[PDB]
Write a protein that binds this ligand. Structure first.
Ligand SMILES: Nc1nc2c(ncn2[C@@H]2O[C@H](COP(=O)(O)OP(=O)(O)O)[C@@H](O)[C@H]2O)c(=O)[nH]1
Ligand SMILES: [Mg+2]
Length: 159
């Protein structure tokens, strides 16, 4: 209730890549196969209490963002080819303090994977964004994405 810091976080990427599910898995530790612009979660980093305002309005503005989660779907090449456009919109129309994690979502759908782990890692290195493969569905690397984002926002905040 009594936080030291508040970070504005945006989830961006093409529609159907799992932006909304990623948010719902992190904030309500839920996912379902079956109105909300943002959700709030408070996290503990070192002794600090950090309020996260996590926005999910990409599929419907950037200047204030501490942090971006740039999502593509590993089962959809179009979502991954689009990452460059998304990255361009970030580095242009954002606070030059903003951190970014590249996220290949739905790593649970191994049979329909069209994007390799290493293509993802390689695009990460090209764009200068750390990278995680995730599943909102199986709860894989959702926690680690947000906490890594908080950590690097803190590092930059300290500089
Ligand atoms: N298999 C799998 N499906 C997912 C995952 N995340 C989301 N989905 C599904 O992919 C579709 C798009 O989800 P949604 O979160 O609405 O995508 P958004 O349009 O980017 O918000 C829905 O059918 C979800 O149930 C995941 O990690 N694994
Ligand atoms: Mg959505």
């Amino acid at each position: 209730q009594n936080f030291d810091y508040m970070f504005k976080l945006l989830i961006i990427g093409n529609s159907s890549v799992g932006k909304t599910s990623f948010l719902f898995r992190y904030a309500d530790d839920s996912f379902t196969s079956a109105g909300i612009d943002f959700k709030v979660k408070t996290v503990f980093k070192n002794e600090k209490r950090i309020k996260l305002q996590i926005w999910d309005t990409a599929g419907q503005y950037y200047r204030g963002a501490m942090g971006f989660i740039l999502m593509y779907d590993i089962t959809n090449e179009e979502s991954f080819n689009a990452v460059q456009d998304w990255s361009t919109q970030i580095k242009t129309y954002s606070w030059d303090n903003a951190q970014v994690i590249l996220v290949g979502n739905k790593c649970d759908m191994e049979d329909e994977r069209v994007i390799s782990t290493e293509r993802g890692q390689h695009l990460g290195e090209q764009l200068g964004f750390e990278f995680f493969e995730t599943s909102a569905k199986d709860n894989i690397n959702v926690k680690q994405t947000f906490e890594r984002l908080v950590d690097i926002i803190c590092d930059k905040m300290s500089e």
